[PDB]
Design a protein around this ligand. Structure first.
Ligand SMILES: [Mg+2]
Length: 844
RNA sequence: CAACCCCGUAAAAAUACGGGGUUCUGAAACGCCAACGAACAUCAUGACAGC
């Protein structure tokens, strides 16, 4: 196998640019900035030098550039000017894109790389907006301000929809404290969501890039309050909340003033600045804890205090490098100039070992002050600090309109999805700034078209990148606690049995098990079961995910097919299977060592789960996680019940989550197809009120330019994918392709998955499960036309006979993506679909 | 694991073999951050209580 971590990239080279006949070589800088190193000019080719940089001994040999870095070794790279067309992309849209964004064609390859980073900023945003729209459409079943009341029809639907009580399932989007927001704020949020949704599918075409002159004076007011809400909560009473951590830190560092520690802690914790530095801090800490002198904090005595312990340890590492500017730089360069992946691990081990000896004593001093007695003492004297530090607070700084829109989106997403959106955006913006820096340094054109000029400039992009980092930290924090209500209790009992039964029956069982007095107040005596449900099924992140993306009425079908359950359990490692088996075993099961024996018992336990088993829980008992030998008969029974429920919810959560992941990767393909058709000048026709998505692949199969410098090449020696796409184009249904597009847009695989998951034969990947469900929907609903294509009958017979999807049918309805071969191969071959599960391609 | 370009020995095929490049190919350049991922996550020790 070949890795993109090549010799040239290791030796120091970052980029190789072509400008007006000369070639320019750059090198790595501070963070992501690039500095100029060498220039080879035209004709004479003296191999000119620009700065010391890191490159040395650059020469030209044939069509190759031969250079050398700081280490003694020879690196070889290819001259960018010795190509059939310099800087041209495989999709043949360089000039069109440059004219669309800048207004004139350029003789270089710097601008098109910048344009693709902008093109990548819209795929992930479209994915997440589609997910959010589906979530709101699923949980709640189906002009500016004044006209809506005058309509008398939209007002009668908005007043009732806003009246729905399922809005609690989104944490802070619609509910503050324990009361509903004003109507106009909800209206503003919904209108903004609709506008972004209609923008991201490709309102004016420049809406997102100029919002100051296209937002009314009432939408700006709403976005400001939501940002001011979270900032005032954290900025105020910051000293009172974090008294324990500040007292310990000032004890470890006695020679430092109180003001310095307070400011340093604010940067480490609120606006995290220790993450994007160059080396991992979490990974360094893990290796230090495996040393002989420090392998005690891994024991069970520190289970109750482990989140607080690890925060203190990380701050000590960050503070050590914030004062040693020489050792920090050496570590980054060592990691950036490594040969293989095994070499990186050796560097981390050496650094981790030498740190444990240097600052291991400070680790123990902090760990001797984290216990029950000391923590309570500190909390009493919480008003002994008086520090201003008002300048660096996040509340005393304005924020842009683009960043405020992102925060509003974060109010409707969970922890993992916030990471995916913000991480991708940060990377794209960092790359854009570097390209503008190189262009401005070389005296080339850097001004965008007037429409894009306000947003796409270096002065604004730096501000946006700084704001996006804070939003990631502040929007993932735990929201304030809220009181559970009757609606949530109904859904909790509807998962553990009680599927599709009248609300009166659920209400009667609520009265019998959770007593309510004659005055509408709970009885103080017996409330064990209610606390068990609230603390294990209502306050779990998995339960929220199941309600948003699935239906509690029909969610029990996923654990009735042994093939589906056994596929999920087989992926869990052996160590975690043993712990599940031990706690959840029972009393009449012999102890076994084989893995397959353990899966069989666990599979049966998940299948038979009812709420009546948990009706007698010793909720009043206390479980000791520090010394597991002090637990007794009543305590151990409680552990079994909360372990079973966690396994029950986890299996459903994993199946639902992975089906959404596969679906979103098909939204990207359809989003790109509409974008590319407009640029290439090809319109998508209509026939019998359908959309022929296969028009672009037919048009580009008979184009002279695309068949010479394109993905689909028709020449002697490179005529492989031209034939296959042409052959597969003859085996397609217009109805089948159109039906597939509607399935992906509405995410109907996840929603209608209770009617077709009971008959799957054998599973080996999530790819097979997704396509089995798709091909079952087409067969039952008669979404095909055998008259126009006599081959769709053969595919359906293969599916019904073998109880598994057909490989030749996935190539029929995924053909409108054939003009891009890498995307077509990835989405039609199981081996190449998943990045984390690579397998050899099956030749046949 | 697949794509594209350059360079070598056979050769006119859906060309095979052996080397090197690629932010201008696909969720996809290097070093952080993320994801796979299930024992979690998180400005606030843990548990009970309160809803
Ligand atoms: Mg790219």
């Amino acid at each position: 196998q070949k890795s993109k971590k090549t010799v040239s990239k290791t030796s120091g080279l970052k980029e190789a640019l072509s400008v007006q006949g000369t070639v320019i070589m750059t090198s790595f800088g501070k963070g992501n900035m690039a500095n100029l190193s060498y220039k080879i000019p035209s004709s004479q080719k003296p191999q000119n030098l620009n700065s010391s940089a890191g490159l040395k001994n650059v020469e030209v040999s044939g069509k190759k550039i031969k250079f050398q870095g700081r280490h003694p070794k020879i690196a070889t790279t290819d001259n960018p000017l010795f190509k059939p067309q310099p800087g041209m992309d495989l999709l043949c849209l360089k000039d069109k894109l440059e004219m669309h964004y800048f207004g004139k064609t350029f003789d270089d390859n710097i601008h098109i790389q910048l344009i693709y980073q902008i093109l990548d900023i819209e795929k992930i945003l479209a994915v997440h907006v589609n997910n959010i729209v589906f979530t709101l459409d699923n949980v709640l079943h189906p002009l500016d301000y004044q006209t809506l009341r005058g309509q008398t029809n939209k007002y009668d639907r908005f007043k009732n929809y806003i009246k729905r009580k399922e809005l609690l399932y989104f944490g802070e989007a619609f509910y503050h404290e324990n009361e509903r927001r004003y109507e106009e704020d909800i209206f503003a949020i919904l209108t903004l969501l609709s506008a972004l949704a209609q923008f991201c599918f490709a309102v004016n075409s420049f809406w997102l890039y100029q919002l100051e002159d296209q937002l009314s004076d009432e939408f700006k007011e709403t976005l400001s309050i939501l940002w001011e809400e979270v900032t005032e909560r954290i900025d105020s009473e910051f000293l009172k909340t974090n008294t324990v951590n500040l007292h310990i830190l000032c004890h470890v560092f006695p020679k430092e003033s109180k003001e310095t520690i307070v400011r340093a802690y604010y940067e480490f914790l609120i606006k995290k600045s220790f993450k994007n530095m160059g080396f991992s801090i979490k990974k360094l800490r893990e290796i230090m804890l495996e040393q002989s002198d420090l392998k005690s904090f891994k024991e069970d005595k520190y289970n109750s205090v482990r989140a607080k312990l690890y925060k203190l340890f990380d701050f000590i590492i960050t503070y050590y490098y914030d004062h040693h500017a020489f050792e920090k730089e050496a570590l980054v360069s060592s990691l950036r100039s490594s040969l293989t992946e095994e070499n990186k691990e050796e560097i981390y081990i050496k650094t981790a070992r030498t740190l444990a000896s240097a600052l291991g004593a400070d680790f123990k001093k902090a760990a001797a002050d984290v216990n029950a007695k000391n923590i309570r003492d500190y909390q009493k004297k919480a008003n002994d600090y008086r520090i201003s530090f008002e300048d660096i607070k996040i509340g005393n700084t304005g924020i842009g309109y683009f960043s405020e829109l992102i925060y509003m989106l974060t109010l409707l997403l969970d922890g993992k999805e916030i990471n995916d959106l913000l991480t991708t955006l940060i990377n794209k913006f960092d790359n854009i700034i570097s390209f503008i820096d190189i262009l401005k340094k070389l005296n080339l054109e850097f001004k965008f078209k007037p429409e894009y000029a306000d947003f796409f400039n270096m002065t604004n992009c730096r501000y946006t990148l700084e704001e996006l980092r804070v939003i990631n930290s502040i929007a993932r924090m735990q929201k304030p606690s809220a009181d559970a209500r009757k609606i949530m209790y109904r859904d909790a009992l509807r998962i553990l049995g009680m599927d599709n039964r009248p609300d009166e029956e659920i209400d009667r069982e609520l009265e019998r098990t959770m007593p309510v007095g004659a005055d509408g107040k709970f009885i103080k005596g017996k409330q064990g079961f209610r606390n068990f449900i609230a603390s294990n099924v209502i306050e779990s992140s998995r339960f929220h995910y199941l309600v948003r993306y699935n239906n509690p009425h029909k969610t029990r079908t996923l654990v009735k097919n042994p093939n589906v359950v056994k596929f999920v359990l087989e992926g869990i490692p052996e160590t975690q299977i043993k712990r599940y088996f031990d706690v959840c075993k029972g009393q009449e099961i012999p102890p076994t060592s084989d893995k397959s024996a353990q899966i069989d018992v666990l599979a049966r336990i998940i299948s038979s789960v009812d709420y009546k088993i948990f009706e007698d829980v010793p909720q009043s008992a206390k479980i000791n996680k520090d010394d597991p030998s002090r637990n007794f008969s009543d305590a151990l029974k409680k552990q079994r019940y909360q372990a079973i429920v966690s396994l029950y919810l986890t299996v459903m959560y994993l199946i639902t989550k992975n089906l959404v992941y596969v679906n979103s990767r098909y939204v990207i393909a359809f989003h790109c197809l509409e974008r590319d058709a407009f640029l290439h000048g090809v319109t998508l026709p209509k026939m019998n009120k359908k959309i022929v998505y296969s028009q672009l692949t037919t048009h580009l199969l008979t184009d002279k330019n695309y068949t010479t410098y394109g993905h689909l090449k028709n020449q002697k020696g490179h005529r492989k994918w031209y034939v296959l796409v042409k052959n597969n184009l003859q085996n397609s249904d217009i109805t089948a392709v159109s039906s597939f597009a509607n399935i992906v847009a509405a995410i109907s695989v996840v929603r209608n998955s209770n009617e077709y998951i009971s008959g799957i034969g054998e599973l080996h990947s999530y790819f097979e499960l997704y396509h089995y469900l798709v091909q079952s929907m087409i067969a039952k609903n008669n979404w095909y036309d055998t008259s126009h294509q006599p081959k769709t009958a053969e595919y359906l017979n293969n599916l019904k006979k073998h109880h598994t999807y057909c490989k030749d049918f996935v190539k029929a309805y995924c053909i409108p993506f054939g003009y891009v071969v890498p995307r077509y191969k990835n989405l039609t071959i199981n081996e190449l679909f998943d990045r984390n599960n690579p397998n050899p391609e099956p030749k046949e």
